[PDB]
Every structure is written in C-alpha cells, then in structure tokens.
Amino acid sequence: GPWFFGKIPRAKAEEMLSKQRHDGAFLIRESESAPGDFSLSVKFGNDVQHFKVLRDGAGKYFLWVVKFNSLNELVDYHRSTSVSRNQQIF
C-alpha cells in the first residue's frame, strides 16, 4: 500500500510495523527535527530494523553507496536489492 507516513513518531511506526505478518513490510518516516531527514523502517523476523536515508552534498538519497534522486527510486531499487548487510527485501 502506501509507504510514506510523514512525521509519524518512531514508536508509532514501530507499533505499525511490528504487527505486520510479512518480512519486508516497510515505511519511510520524516524527522520532525531535521527537514528532509528520512528513515526507513523494515520488519524482519521478530524485529524492526531502522535505516537512515543519507543525503550527499547534492541532496541525493542513499543507504550505503548507490544514490537516488527520489525516495521512490530508492524504494523501488530496494524491492530487488537488499537494504541490509543481510538479505532484506520488500
């Protein structure tokens, strides 16, 4: 369904996710403190892992190395490439 939840509190995001049935359900939340600081929360097993969406000096987004111009591109790329140094897909 939707994956962007705006400035939803970390704890509420984890409550949402933690209840999901499937390994790979995710959301992106935006920091209330830092405009355009995004986090990706992903359910896996009994935990919910959290990845900061990094920005480079041109404002591109990335998790580790590869850069994306938009959150949508990052999400779609990580539908087939793992977000973790562990096998984590959507």
Ligand X SMILES: NC(=O)C[C@@H]1NC(=O)C2(CCCCC2)NC(=O)C[C@@H](c2ccc(CC(=O)O)cc2)/C=C/C[C@@H](Cc2cccc3ccccc23)CNC1=O
Q: Please report, for residues 12, 32, 45, the alpha-carbon distance to residue 61 in angstroms, rounded to integers and kept in the order given.
A: 24, 18, 26
Residue 8 interface partner, choices ligand X, a second copy, none, CB cut-off 5-8 Å depending on type? a second copy
- Residue 28 in contact with a second copy, rule: CB under 8 A: yes
71 binds a second copy (CB under 8 A): yes
Residue from 21, 22, 35, 65 touching a second copy (CB under 8 A): that is: 35
**43-75 b/e (C-beta count within 10 Å ≥ 16 → b):** bbeeebbebebeeeeeeebebeeeebeebeebb
Which residues contact a second copy (rule: CB under 8 A)? Answer: 1-10, 12-13, 26-38, 41, 52, 55, 57-61, 69-73
